[PDB]
Structures are given as structure tokens and as C-alpha cells.
Symmetry: C5
Subunit: 216 residues, 5 copies
């Protein structure tokens, strides 16, 4: 009825007003500082080991990388915005963390839309799907124990003083692993590590993705 038509128009206006209030009126987050450190939660969903190249020692993975963080500057009261509790927005509208593979051999290829979900508590969920080529010797992939490779993910430019990394579990999600891959997974772990590098005095944080796999 007319009332239903009005409710939907009102709901669109409230979303456009919320996005306007958060992005246009307030300056974009300048990133974390020593005085305001940001925790980023990382989890991997391994979809496929596409290729294991024994001529270059590169292995190609397809995965989804779940990134979660919470900003005060993205908080709202749903009661002020027609009970909107979250919205979908372009990744380019918000700050995102510079989470990088430390041993890639080619630029990562993005396989999903660059859209994130922002929730009224200021929490952000971003899940880029990626194809990655990384440094991996697949010697032993044709064996019962298979091959073992590892790749570290973390901020490229922020130390543990500015960006802390967390995992909810040390188990890579294999519930979406392609059942007819050339490679079967023996195990896949994701482990937070804290290091000191020779160059620098700050602690450095990474999540180490370790995959044991063999030819099916």
C-alpha cells in the first residue's frame, strides 16, 4: 500500500543519510598509531591448490581471507537511523589494513568484489578471495607425507605497536576445499607469530599459513 511504498523510500533515505554522516561529514580514519593500536583478526578458507611448479618452486593457492577490525569512528546508534544495524560499502570508502603475503612471487589476483560489511558497533568484515603464487618447493608432493609449504601474512608498513594480528582458531577452514583438486590437504594451519628483525627494535606480527598437501 502507500504506507509500504513510504517505508521503503524512508529506509533508503536513512541508509544514504547514515553513509553521508559517517563518510562525508567525518574525515576518513588516518590508520592506527602507537597510542591507538588496532587488532585485525585474520582467518583463511583454502579453496584449492591450483598448481605446484617444481621448475620454479612456486605454488598457486585460491583462498578467501577474512579480515575483521573495529573502529570507534564507524559506530552509530541504529535507533537514530531507522534501526539500520549494518550496511555493505565499497572497500575504497573505508580504511582497510595493508595485510600482505611476505613471500609472493606475483601480484595477488583478486577474485571477489571489493565490498565490506560495516556493523553499528564499528566492526568491519572484509573477505577478499585471492589467487596467490608464493615461494614453495613441492618436492615430496608425490609421497605419502606430501610436501610442506608456508607463507607469512601481515602488515607491510605497521609494526606490532600499531597493528596487532589475531586468529580465532589455528585451523584453516577446509569446509570449501575443492574435492577434485589435483592436491589433497593433509593439514592447513594459521599461526600468529611475534618476531624481532635485526634492522628494527619494534615487535613484528604475522600469521603463518602452513599447508601439507600431496597429489590425489
Amino acid at each position: 500500500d502507500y504506507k509500504d511504498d513510504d517505508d521503503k523510500l524512508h529506509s533508503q533515505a536513512n541508509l544514504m543519510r547514515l553513509k553521508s554522516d559517517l563518510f562525508n561529514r567525518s574525515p576518513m580514519y588516518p590508520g592506527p598509531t602507537k597510542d591507538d593500536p588496532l587488532t585485525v583478526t585474520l582467518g583463511f578458507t583454502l579453496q584449492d591448490i591450483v598448481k605446484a611448479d617444481s621448475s620454479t618452486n612456486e605454488v598457486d593457492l585460491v583462498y578467501y581471507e577474512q579480515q575483521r577490525w573495529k573502529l570507534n569512528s564507524l559506530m552509530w546508534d541504529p535507533n537514530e537511523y531507522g534501526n539500520i544495524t549494518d550496511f555493505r560499502t565499497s572497500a575504497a570508502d573505508i580504511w582497510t589494513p595493508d595485510i600482505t603475503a611476505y613471500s609472493s612471487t606475483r601480484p595477488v589476483q583478486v577474485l571477489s568484489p571489493q565490498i565490506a560489511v560495516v556493523t553499528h558497533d564499528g566492526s568491519v568484515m572484509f573477505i577478499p578471495a585471492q589467487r596467490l603464487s608464493f615461494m614453495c618447493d613441492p618436492t615430496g608432493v608425490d609421497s605419502e607425507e606430501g610436501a610442506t609449504c608456508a607463507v607469512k601474512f601481515g602488515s607491510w608498513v605497521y609494526s606490532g605497536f600499531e597493528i596487532d594480528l589475531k586468529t580465532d582458531t589455528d585451523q584453516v577452514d577446509l569446509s570449501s576445499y575443492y574435492a577434485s583438486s589435483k592436491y589433497e590437504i593433509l593439514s592447513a594451519t594459521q599461526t600468529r607469530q611475534v618476531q624481532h628483525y635485526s634492522c628494527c627494535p619494534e615487535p613484528y606480527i604475522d600469521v603463518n599459513l602452513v599447508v601439507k598437501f600431496r597429489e590425489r
Copy 2:
């Protein structure tokens, strides 16, 4: 009256994209149904070293927004127009088992109709996860790829097919592979992570060496 026709279309586009506020995407309060259909043009390549298959197809997408409606009488009886896909909201329909970024083979232009219906038909080359084992036998190989929103649940975007049969009428007659069958089926799925329903369209292709 050609000057008037151009003026009427420039006025219509100006009215819709400036003087009317734009759509910000669907919500639980204002859910959107997207209709999807595939026209399979070619299975270009089936790689048994990586279990990747390369498809060329076009994907018909259709949806309807109240904000893209107009009265043709008020605009010299214009009933539709073509516009850049960047001038309008488009759904984030994604292959769930791609192994490479989709390559776009057609112009990013949509057709908008006076009822607010949009039709967008991107032609694509897709590499996806597929074991071609059996492709060199009479019963052939079977592979499947799901398509849906990456970021919207069933509470914001619903999907539909207008038919469950993939359009094979443009399938390349001299492909290295013949199609035994091609289906496109709406599926409702729950994931352990999340409470909301998730909707996809499952493209299932059975094929063999010509």
C-alpha cells in the same frame, strides 16, 4: 524532431541520475530479486594438470528499481535507454570457484526500461575449478560452478532463473568440446559461520571431446 528526441533522453537521464536521489543497494527492508541466465558460447580449454576449465559465456542479469521508473508520456514516449553500467547500481554476482579474475569480453552498458527494469548482459571468460577426468569417454566429464552475491545474504538479494536450461543456441559448433547438458538451478544454502540463508545459481556442465 530528432533534436527534441535527443533533448527528451538527456532530460530523462538528468532527472533520474541528478534530481532523483540514487539507490544505495538492497537492504532487509527493501530486498532485491536478481534474475540470472547463462548462454554458453564455448569451453575453450580443459587443463588436466591443474583441474581448471575455461568457459566463454554471457550472463544475463535482470532486476527492477522503483527509482529507475518514469512515464514515457512525460519524455516524448521514450520507453527505454542504454547507459554505462557505472551510472547505475549493479549486483555483485560472483563465481564462487573461479581460479583467475573473470575477463570481460563485452561493453559495460545496461538497458533501463520505463518500469525500472534493468537488463545487463556481460560476456565473460571464466577459469574455474573442474576435473575434466572422463572428457575423452562417451559419458564425458561433469563440472559445476555456483554464482551469487559475494556480500549480500538471501535477506537482501534473492536470485531466480527464468529457466533451468542453459541457453546452448550460441554454443560454438566447432568447439574442441561438445555439451551433453547444461543446467542452471537456484540453490538455498546455510553455512556454519552465519545464521541467514545464502542463495546461488549452480551451473552444471557435462561435456566431452568432440
Copy 3:
């Protein structure tokens, strides 16, 4: 020197009046349809892949059309009869290959020539991979393949296509190509589709070729 300074001001003034002082052209309509003239200059058959049935062509695609909105009187602008402009500054037709297997690769600058009669000429050089079974390329008869070109989104009611000739220009064909051309034609076709009421127009490029011996 003063003359050169005057000629530049006139061109900058013409371009500004045409683009800055005019609302952007919305494309053709059923009431204001456009004819696009297409012609192909085939430079090379670079690759014929029998494992995927893909063939790679290098060609120049000439496109011509005319808009009243790009017309000017040369006498009003220092007797300027034409100018070069970025293809982004003007409307261009969405002429697409219908059976490509990869995005077209652009080999030339995206710049067009506009004449005072409102006519535009645009000649993109392209590498195209398209669906082609090269079986018989190593025989006297050779292989035959075909690719249709037309608007992706406009019907025959908005965009008509024409050719000046049904003969593909082979005068630039690479004399030392792996493949020699037995024939190459470009033919306007009118098609009807069960989906849709209006006629659809394409230009069918048919190439007969064999391995150079």
C-alpha cells in the same frame, strides 16, 4: 607567430563550444538512429591454436559515423575544417566481436578525427583471439573461420551498420605471415532473435587461410 597563436585559440574555442557548452550525447535512439560504417584492414594471422580452436588476428577496424551535435561552420572558427580528439572526449559506438575468447588488445592510440560536417573517423588497431577451428590450414583448400561484429546493446532500430566494400583490405597484410589469405570478406547481415522484437545488424568477417609454403 601571432597567426599560430590565433589558430590555437580558435581550435581551443571550437572544442570548448562543442564539448564544454553542450550536454553529453546520450547515444542513438529509434527516433534519431545512427549509421556506423565499418571496414577491416587485416594485418596478420599471428596464431592458429588447434588445441583450443582459437585464432589470433591483428587488424585495423575503421569506424565512421556522423552527429549533428559535432557540426560547425569553419568560417566561425578560423576556417578549422577538422581536429583530432581523445576517444574519451566523444561518444563512440560499442562495436564488439561476438565470438572473442579474450579481451581485445588495443595496439593504437584512442584518438579520433572529427570533421565540420559532424563526421567522426576512428581506426583502432586490435589483436583479437576468437573461436576458430583451423582444421585444413595445412591443405590446399585451407581453413575457413568467421567472426561477427556489431553493437552489444543497440538493435537495428538505433544503430545500423554498413560497409563501403565487402572486400577486407589486404593491402597491409604481412607478406611473411605464417598464414597466407585465400579470401577475406566483410558482409552486413540482418538477424532476428526469438528473445526480442527488433532486427539486429552485424558485419560478418569471413577469412579463408592456409599455411604459407
Copy 4:
């Protein structure tokens, strides 16, 4: 003084770019000087008759709109600028088989007399039959370079020498250069009444 030199350069660029070129015309034609430095023949593919070259292409032209009095800007005589801040000529290979790959930063040098020097390093795949590369006499291939859209009436081309600069040629390339020439040509095409100008690069090479 370092602050002043920076102030003067910023003011010169604002004066040249933000104070007020639509390209050459029949009434205002431009001469472009081209010179090639051949660094490597990377690949010669006898299965497709494509050859891959790495070279840098020196481009020089002169505009009245780019000239200034150095005395008015702290005696600045030249500056570096992004190639996107200025008009650049649409010099194209006429027989490329793939889009050119740019190997260098897109930055030009502008001098107070209005002269511009722009030296893009490129990898080019072009149409070339390497038949005979495995013999004493070697293979011969050629590629024309010129404006894609401007005739001889708007852009003329010049070389400073007909000798391609080989002083930077990779000493351990798979291919040794027997000769490399760059020759201005006046072309007539049966499509078109205008004269067309190109520089023809002819390379004679063989397997080392």
C-alpha cells in the same frame, strides 16, 4: 634560497599549466625528432613470426607555449614533469602484435626554449620472420614508427642520424646485431590523399 628555488619552480609550473596546447594543425605543424637505442632482441618466435625488442625511443619537439624567461623564475632553465602534464605525440609502431610494455617512468624534461625530451623504454612484439637467424647472413626485419592519427600536414618526423644507437646493446643477448638503421620515409596510402611520415627501423641480426 632552497625554499626560493622550490617556490620559483612551483610558480613556473603553475604559470605554464594552470595559466593556459590542443596538438598540431595544418597551420601550426610540429616536427618530432625520433631516435632508437636498441638494448636487446629478447625473443624470435619462428612459430608465430613475432620478434620481441627492448629499446628506448628518444622523442624531441618544441612548443612556443612551453617557453619562459629564466630571469623571471630564479634562473630555472629546465624542469622534470610527469608526461601527463603535457601534450605528447602519438608515435606508434605500425606492425605491433601486442600492446607495447612501458619499462621506464613517464617523465619528460622541458627546457626554457620550449623544447621537450621524452625517452620511454619499451618492450615491443612486432611482425618478423626470423628465417636465416641461424646463418652467417642472419635475418632482416623492419617496423615503421609514426603518428597514428596525424598526417605529414600536422606532424613531420626527423632523425638526427640514420644509425640506431647500439652502444647499450646487451653483450650476452641470444642475438648479435649486424646492422640497425632508422630512416625517415614519406608514405602514400591508397586510402588517403595526405602524405604520411614514418621512421623505418630495419634490424639485421643472427644467433650469437
Copy 5:
């Protein structure tokens, strides 16, 4: 924590260069961290390296007083936001592929540190890679458009950092040096500066 964010936002606004000149020349410190020789192609004499290239420079225009900005001593910013040097490989065969985010660290003294991870294909004959002596290849890095009078190049050390070299690479590094060189060309009277990266490598045994 609201005060810290406000002060950082204020600093970046206040701060936000036309590049170096003969009168305002710049020094760029380069250091290489070699991670992997991925590929050596004897059919084309092209070798593919993965490395991190550390670039450091100092601008007076990027200086601030930390006391005026709530004791902020540095910040991270998009490389797009600031001037960066046009340091280029002189013998690449393909465009460099960037493997890391284009973000730099700016310090209150006006110093900038930018560390792009890159994959480079460059001109290299790998003959002898399967021998005890291995193969030797070299690639020069420098400004494409600035002479030694506008950009000086230097290294902190002539030893390439190998502490991150992939232990299971197809190729082991026998040595890797990074050496400032001064050169002259017939065209040009002013001196040109490059850092010459020399790598001696061989098949892992």
C-alpha cells in the same frame, strides 16, 4: 585515543613538492634484500628476481615539531600522497610487478622510507649456473630522468641483504653486491649515478 587521531589528521592536513633540482638536490639511499631467483631462461637470457628495494630520502618540506602535534614522531601514508624517486632498472625486459602496498613511513625529521617488494625480469645469461663457479649477472638501478646534480644515489653497505633469501629456491646465491657507480654518456656532460646489483648464483645441489 580521540586526541591522537585528531592530531594525526591535523598533521597530515597541514603538511598536505616539485622534485629535486641543481639548487635543491636530493640524496636517495638504496638497499636491496634479495628473496628469490624464481626463473632463469637460457632460451631468452632473462632471469626473474623477487626482492625488496629500500629507498630513503629527506625533504625539509616534510619536517614538523612533534610537540606541536601531540608527540607524533612518524606516520604511514600512501606513496601517491608524496613525491617518490623514479628509481628504475636499466636492463628490465618486462614491466616491474609490485608485490607490496604502495605505502611509505614519514618521520618528523623529514625522512621517508619506502620499501616496495618487486618481481623483475632482466637481461641475464645464466650459462654456467650448473657449474661450481655458477653464473654472474648484473642490473643497474638509477633515476631515469635526473642526473647526479639533482639526485645523488648511495648505499649504506655494498652487501645485498640475503638474510631473507628463500632457503628452498631453485638457485643458491654465491654472492650479491650493490655498488654505487658514476658514469658519463656521449650525449650528456653531467655525471649519472647508478647502483649496480651483481648476483652470482648456481643450481641448488
